[PDB]
Write a protein that binds this ligand. Structure first.
Ligand SMILES: Cc1cc2nc3c(=O)[nH]c(=O)nc-3n(C[C@H](O)[C@H](O)[C@H](O)COP(=O)(O)OP(=O)(O)OC[C@H]3O[C@@H](n4cnc5c(N)ncnc54)[C@H](O)[C@@H]3O)c2cc1C
Ligand SMILES: Cc1cc2nc3c(=O)[nH]c(=O)nc-3n(C[C@H](O)[C@H](O)[C@H](O)COP(=O)(O)OP(=O)(O)OC[C@H]3O[C@@H](n4cnc5c(N)ncnc54)[C@H](O)[C@@H]3O)c2cc1C
Lengths: 622, 622
């Protein structure tokens, strides 16, 4: 029954969050154990085979900078690479890759399979062990049960999910996988609140039944970009293009005629295609993408045609488009409904506020997307391994990582939509960029021992480069009567009228970095342009960064002021009943987090501070 | 409900038999449809990751010679290659390959995914449609149902299987896959007889917890062999070795002490390890192999330590061996029990004798092993596509293929062991070799259109080579007083005493082929030694082949004399009651097949022939 070796941390579920949690826990020198249903599914993509995008590439870069694997399994599995918002400011660009599925699966499995201090085990779980608000050990299906000092759950969408097609349904965790039914009941009996969500995916087409000779092609950028701060372009496999098609009035007529057979007729947008036509009935054209699932299989994923209509309607819609006159379907489209937990009963370190040692990550945190789970899993594993070693935990803030924004929003949003990350959703966009993620996370990774020697050496060299470039550009001066100033004045507007300097010379918006590096002064730029772009970003954004920094420094006291979960706001005088109910329901962790809740005003926080000072539950508030 | 396109043949289950059936049916120019649970499992190996062996390599060669895929997916996925019985006569050699699992899975999937006239579909089946002893169409789970002129079932071990560990059990098709429960009931209600069998598999070890520094290594053959008659050695990936270890008295003591916890305490041999110790208690040492599952994962398969004991005993046995003092297990060992059909109610063309159009192949035919299913599936698909096109079927005999022996034995054996192919199990070993499989099967493949142009050209060139070599060796003559005969007499015993010839010169057993080719006469051999070995085999085995040929030619009349399944042997005078019951139970297809049944004597077949002549159910018997 009892396994004769105790472990530090146990992860239940090796999906997109469990793998990151296990890697982070094992790399931090703690004995790690990973339980999963079945192997060879590690790294499986059950949806659109794409990685990154607007708001998703930032999370990938954050995971990579702190010692992740998602950004390294994609450099050897991407079949198309593009940069989004390339023409705009560097703070908003993103990198999106159409990925070969098998290469990604194998990179993930092989990287995870050779990780020291970690062991994997193929078995389901059926219950957990808890006494005195402490979780110790998990129970498998055969009868064998383990013991550990910390447990992380990364079930995802397998918590008692049903597949829905048309008006019919059947049990299933996804296309071809079984459901984890009893664990749903076992977690439900625990004092938690559980709900249900539903999302769908379109069918798959056969590439040798589509006449691509009349379909428009689309390509990526000529210089293929990279995700990780370590690899280069020599690791990418061969490239393939994508095909673009459209719909026509016959498709809309068929959808409207057969709209009766649907469970519906809901997010604030339109995920399906019948929603696309009904919400906007005047539009008569839509864009559909056809992209290959890999360079060695002829299955095409259609993007933009997701629905929940029965099979006959699916076939008619597929067969009523240009280039799809005679098409075959290998995998029908379908939706799924799964359980989740409301993210208002766990600490910002992704630990349940009621149980000691229990952690949550992945889809069960009311989110969606591959990138929205890896960061949660990595942070959960980090905190779990810190706790098992009896040291203080860690959690990022809204001003240094998109993960901090994601956690804070999931804690104090209260909406019902699946959480999708967007660039504008964060208030510190101008500094929370992609190229500087390592510059603001790898030192923390090194302090907690998540970063090995190669990354440390690379970052030290890069920082030395940046500092030397800053100093040398600060060490130049020009005058209008300078011997070489004729050409300087020639190709620069507003010619020099006083002592000039490169740090001030570049302040003009029209000038660039490489142009200034090509000059009689301002000697040739350093060979590592990856470090060179940093100085350009800093000089262009110095004013806004300074304003935001002195802004952030002011709320630090409210960030530090903690509020214990045992607090009973009914014992506070001067606060309205609605505010008391709201604060009792949310149970924030800090006064600043409470202030971010909708419905609380500065009067409420002032009265709360007065009450805290009265009860002595605060050392000081300055 | 009804799918708007009718197909020629539908295969249910894309495993090891379904893929071959689909490829054979599609390559024969018939619209083929393949239903499966889930994709990315095509080519999965759920047991010892090895291909070929004694009696299994012959089946692989037969499948390859007739247009199969198993021999082509192994040349790009094998991590170790060996020849068994290399020192013995060429009629008994075999080729065994330790295979990388992922490369095999991907080769299979990519080869199957680009097959013209074939389409794949991911869905389970829940029932079949039959009227007036005819099967037309199958019903899926969602509700969509198809129509076809022929149906082939390749379920394997998923017909309502239970996983067993120790004294506990749970439903499962295998480790990580769901069971197909309702189809078992639907097939059971049909007038068939169904039974249950059980087999097990050992656990998996982690390669980075075993001290291989004190373990013996094993190697293959430097001159690498080949499976397919098309590829070469340039397609094989990098090679890895295998590790050898043993057991000791502590393991036996632990097994004996904890023998009480076992469902048992059965084949005529010992599959498990507790059987190994109990059946032979005097032996105190056993051989265990540790082999890598691939060149990119550190999971080790242990061969020789299969059992059904609970997990604690498994861990003790693993930890009580040299080099395994501190070992980890990633996948526990387990057994499974599954349903099957008794192979006495189907024609030798793998068609049920009662239903029209229904075919059986794979594990449901009471067999085991990868190679024992591919041939069955290929022949079933061949016969199904012949039937759907309204042409006469085909079935090999015992004298031209191991498939004929396998089918004949499964029809008229009556034992209960899982059927394993062995070389000595066939009575025509001396001609049913491996190197000549194409020479006796590819012309039939071409006649039925299973062979494309490349194989046809290669075989035509090879046959031309063989014929020219035979003629040139027949066109030589030597004399004792020949000018170059001094050396001939020097290195050959019994010097020439009369007119000699190479067709007679090689008749000496000590002489070889290459030695004669490097002589004054008998000019250098042809560059294609693959054709050159054939003439050596023919000249060494001519007498035995001639004897066996004139033997086989005599039973052809009994082979041709068919016996309809509607025959009622109770209406025959002069036969004993036991013989009547036996013949009614078996219902053979031919008088020769009936004669191969145990318990019938030549008197019975003579009386049967007399009765057939009386009733006029035979044209003639000569
Ligand atoms: C029908 C469908 C629709 C989708 N729609 C969208 C969409 O609209 N938008 C979008 O962004 N993404 C969508 N997706 C993709 C989805 O977000 C991801 O595939 C996945 O849910 C995110 O990964 P995860 O780690 O959070 O969960 P998963 O990858 O589902 O985590 C499950 C993994 O953990 C293992 N596991 C789980 N529970 C246990 C347990 N108890 N014991 C042991 N092992 C366990 C499983 O074996 C598996 O390996 C969709 C997927 C499907 C199938
Ligand atoms: C526990 C265990 C023990 C084993 N022991 C041995 C042993 O002792 N000796 C040995 O030689 N081999 C052994 N094996 C290996 C086994 O013989 C092969 O893995 C396999 O059973 C033979 O392949 P098959 O094609 O006959 O069947 P399978 O590979 O089992 O065929 C199943 C395939 O068909 C599909 N399928 C099945 N039914 C349906 C359906 N209704 N609809 C759609 N798709 C369907 C499945 O999705 C799957 O792809 C063992 C395997 C296991 C798991």
């Amino acid at each position: 029954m009892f396994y004769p070796d105790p472990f530090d941390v146990i992860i239940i579920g090796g999906g997109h969050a469990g793998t990151e949690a296990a890697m982070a826990a094992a790399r931090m020198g703690q004995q790690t154990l990973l339980l999963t249903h079945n192997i060879d599914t590690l790294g499986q993509m059950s949806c659109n085979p794409a990685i990154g995008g607007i708001g998703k590439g930032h999370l990938v870069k954050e995971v990579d900078a702190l010692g992740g694997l998602m950004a390294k399994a994609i450099d050897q599995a991407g079949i198309q690479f593009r940069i989004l918002n390339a023409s705009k400011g560097p703070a908003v660009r993103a990198t999106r890759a159409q990925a070969d599925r098998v290469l990604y699966r194998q990179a993930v499995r092989t990287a995870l399979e050779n990780q020291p201090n970690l062991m994997i085990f193929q078995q389901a779980v059926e219950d957990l062990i808890v006494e005195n608000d402490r979780v110790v050990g998990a129970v498998t299906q055969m009868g064998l049960k383990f013991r550990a000092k910390a447990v992380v759950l990364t079930v995802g969408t397998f918590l008692d999910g049903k597949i829905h097609i048309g008006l019919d349904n059947y049990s299933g965790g996804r296309a071809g996988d079984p459901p984890s039914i009893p664990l749903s009941r076992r977690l439900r009996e625990l004092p938690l609140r559980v709900g249900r969500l539903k999302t769908g995916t379109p069918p798959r087409i056969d590439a040798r039944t589509i006449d691509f000779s009349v379909l428009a092609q689309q390509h990526g950028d000529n210089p293929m970009p990279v995700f990780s701060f370590m690899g280069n372009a020599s690791q990418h496999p061969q490239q393939v293009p994508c095909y673009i098609t459209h719909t026509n009035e016959k498709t809309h007529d068929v959808i409207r005629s057969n709209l009766d057979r649907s469970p519906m007729y809901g997010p604030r947008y339109c995920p399906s295609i019948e929603d696309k036509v009904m919400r906007f009935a005047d539009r008569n054209q839509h864009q559909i993408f056809l992209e290959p699932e890999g360079l060695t299989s002829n299955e095409i994923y259609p993007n933009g045609i997701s629905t929940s209509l029965p099979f006959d309607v699916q076939m008619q819609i597929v067969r009523s488009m240009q280039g799809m006159e005679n098409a075959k379907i290998v995998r029908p489209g379908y939706a799924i409904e799964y359980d989740f937990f409301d993210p208002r009963d766990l600490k910002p370190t992704l630990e349940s506020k009621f149980i000691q040692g229990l952690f949550f990550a992945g889809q069960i945190n009311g989110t969606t997307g591959y990138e929205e789970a890896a960061a949660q899993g990595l942070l959960a594993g980090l905190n779990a391994a810190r706790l098992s070693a009896d040291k203080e935990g860690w959690a990022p803030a809204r001003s240094q990582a998109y993960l901090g924004v994601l956690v804070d929003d999931l804690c104090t949003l209260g909406t019902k939509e699946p959480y999708r990350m967007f660039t504008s959703r964060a208030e510190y966009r101008l500094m929370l960029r992609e190229d500087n993620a390592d510059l603001r996370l790898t030192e923390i990774g090194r302090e907690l021992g998540l970063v090995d020697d190669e990354r440390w050496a690379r970052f030290n060299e890069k920082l030395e480069n940046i500092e030397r470039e800053r100093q040398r550009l600060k060490s130049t001066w020009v005058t209008p009567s300078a011997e070489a100033a004729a050409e300087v004045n020639a190709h620069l507007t507003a010619p020099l009228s006083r002592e000039a300097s490169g740090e001030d010379l570049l302040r003009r918006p029209e000038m660039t970095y490489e142009k200034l590096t090509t000059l009689t002064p301002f000697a040739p730029a350093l060979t590592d342009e990856q470090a060179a772009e940093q100085v350009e970003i800093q000089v262009k954004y110095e004013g806004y960064i300074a304003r935001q920094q002195d802004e952030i420094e002011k709320q630090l006291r409210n960030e530090n002021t903690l509020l214990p979960a045992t607090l009973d706001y009914r014992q506070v005088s001067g606060l309205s009943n609605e505010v008391i109910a709201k604060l009792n329901d949310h149970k924030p962790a800090s006064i600043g987090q409470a202030s971010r809740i909708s419905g609380v005003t500065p009067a409420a926080i002032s009265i709360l501070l007065v009450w805290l000072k009265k009860q002595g539950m605060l050392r000081r508030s300055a």
